[PDB]
């Protein structure tokens, strides 16, 4: 439901809150969430 990114091979995937925390293709134990889809605005100051 929510995307994730591996910490070594930078491979995108998704998890269902029941899979083991692991990259599907290289088996790394550290993964990162992906950026939000909301709008990000800055004041340029």
């Amino acid at each position: 439901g929510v995307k994730y990114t591996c910490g070594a091979c930078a491979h995108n995937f998704s998890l269902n809150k029941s899979d083991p925390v692991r990259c599907k293709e290289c088996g790394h134990r550290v993964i990162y969430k992906a950026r939000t889809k909301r709008m990000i605005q800055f004041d340029a100051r």
Binding site: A8, C9, D19, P20, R22, K24, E25, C26, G27
Partner: protein
């Protein structure tokens, strides 16, 4: 998927894995550790093969 299934898939893709910088670095580190183990055992025959393999794998840019 289960943990064992994940390990099996990872091993399968490693067999399919032609090359990956992280995996190459890990392999070179493991080879260096094996080489020091052979050196401490005074095995002059294994160390030559490990040195040849390390020379072949190396030479990065």
């Amino acid at each position: 998927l289960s943990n064992d299934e994940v390990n099996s898939i990872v091993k399968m893709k490693q067999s399919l894995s032609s090359n990956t910088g992280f995996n190459t670095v890990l392999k070179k580190a493991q080879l260096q550790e094996e080489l020091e183990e052979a050196r401490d055992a005074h095995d002059h025959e294994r160390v030559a093969r490990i040195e040849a393999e390390l020379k072949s794998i190396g030479a990065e840019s």
